[PDB]
């Protein structure tokens, strides 16, 4: 899948799909 | 629900209910 | 169980068994 670790809500074609971290802080994993 | 992100054990009327972070370190989510 | 919070893959006799943190960054929990 194509995924991004996001500061913001998942993009329209994406779904919240797990957990990642940005600088050690929990963040949305967004996948399409 | 009423929840707090705790350094300590959940208070008496609270239950461990998920995961949060305090300054980027995993911590207890306590809810009542 | 005997567990370690690892930067690397779990050792041969170990299995990935949960999540821990090293300096506030998610890491493998490896247990045997
Ligand atoms: Ca963290
Ligand atoms: Cl983002
Ligand atoms: Cl988690
Ligand atoms: Cl507790
Ligand atoms: Cl290690
Ligand atoms: Cl492994
Ligand atoms: Cl791996």
Q: Where are the beta strands (DSSP E) in chain B?
A: 3-6, 15-22, 25-31
Q: Would you give the distance in Å from CA B12 to the centre of its chain?
A: 12
Query: Do residue B21 and residue A23 have CB atoms under 8 angstroms apart?
Result: no
**For tokens 């949305």, what's the residue?**
A28
CA torsion B3-A23-C25-A9 (nearest 10°) is 50
Nominal resolution in Å? 1.8
C-beta of residue B16 within 8 angstroms of C-beta of residue B28: yes
Distance from CA of A31 to the nearest CA of B (A): 22
Q: Provide, as residue numbers in chain C, all residues whose Cβ is less than 8 Å from the Cβ of A19.
A: 26
CA distance A19 to A2: 14
Please name the method used to determine this structure: X-ray
Q: Provide, as residue numbers in chain A, all residues whose Cβ is less than 8 Å from the Cβ of B19.
A: 26
CA distance B30 to B14: 6
């Amino acid at each position: 899948a194509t995924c991004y670790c996001r500061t913001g809500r998942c993009a329209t074609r994406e779904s919240l799909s797990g957990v990642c971290e940005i600088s050690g802080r929990l963040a949305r994993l967004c996948c399409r």
